[PDB]
Amino acid sequence: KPNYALKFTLAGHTKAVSSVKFSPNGEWLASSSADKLIKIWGAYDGKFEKTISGHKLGISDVAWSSDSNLLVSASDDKTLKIWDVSSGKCLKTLKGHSNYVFCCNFNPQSNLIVSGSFDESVRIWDVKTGKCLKTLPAHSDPVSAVHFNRDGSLIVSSSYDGLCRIWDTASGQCLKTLIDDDNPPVSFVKFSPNGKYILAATLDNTLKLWDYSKGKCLKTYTGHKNEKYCIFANFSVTGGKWIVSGSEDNLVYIWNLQTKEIVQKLQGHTDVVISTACHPTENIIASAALENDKTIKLWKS
């Protein structure tokens, strides 16, 4: 079992936090919020660094480039924006989604950005020119999450239409469609660090680990509350191999990845823990919560 303990509580966001992400170099924590702002914090002391602004409506997601120099954010303003973190500049504003953009990620090469939206599409963008390379008619409902695999050859996406789909990044073809017996909306999905699995969350209080090549559900993680919101889940691999997730009962849940047993619950948030993140080299978890909390918390084992 892990021994995560509260260290820092981080405030500033004037509205509900939507997403928190550690920089790949482990130096920083970026956060986005319905308050239209991005904030940078020291990953180890939670020391506030800077605010990044420009979006005209709330942000639902933010993600780092591989080299920890860039950010992409996804806003209800129907744009993504590429930020240079150190200068604070908006480098590109990506436009073409017809509805709120909900989710984003760079590929590991960070020449491409993938995005998903309420306009039910998945779009691939060129980082250098900021132009939309492909629009995938990916789903029949809002796209809750999008993620590249370890080499960027694949995209996984999830949607309120109950599906999880794997896409060929080069051709844009659907290579797979995953759904279990019940068709609850899929609220989140991401590739495992080695990229052989996908972790996916459904609005039926369930996380599942899938081997997407075989189309098979390997593990199920239950015990948390997730029926209304797109809560991030994570693989934790710095110490034990855990699954980490926020919950609509204001707790952060940690399961043993292999045995599926809850090993720790983190208390202290006063609203839905919408987002959690795992530090790339230390046993640190960042957690953020919604409107009645507005705080980010940093835990260490």
UniProtKB/Swiss-Prot annotation:
Pfam families: Beta-prop_WDR5 (PF25175). It comes from the Eukaryota. WD repeats lie at residues 12-51, 54-95, 97-137, 138-177, 181-222, 225-265, 268-301. Changing F102A: Strongly reduced affinity for histone H3. Significant decrease in interaction with KMT2A. One of its GO terms (biological process) is regulation of cell division. Changing N194A: Loss of interaction with RBBP5 and reduced ability to stimulate KMT2A methyltransferase activity in association with RBBP5 and ASH2L. There is a cross-link at K15 (Glycyl lysine isopeptide (Lys-Gly) (interchain with G-Cter in SUMO2)). GO terms for molecular function: histone binding; histone H3K4 methyltransferase activity; histone H3K4me1 reader activity; histone H3Q5ser reader activity. Changing F102L: Strongly reduced affinity for histone H3. The modification N6-acetyllysine is found at K81. This is WD repeat-containing protein 5. It comes from Homo sapiens. The lineage of its organism: Eukaryota, Metazoa, Chordata, Craniata, Vertebrata. The gene is WDR5.
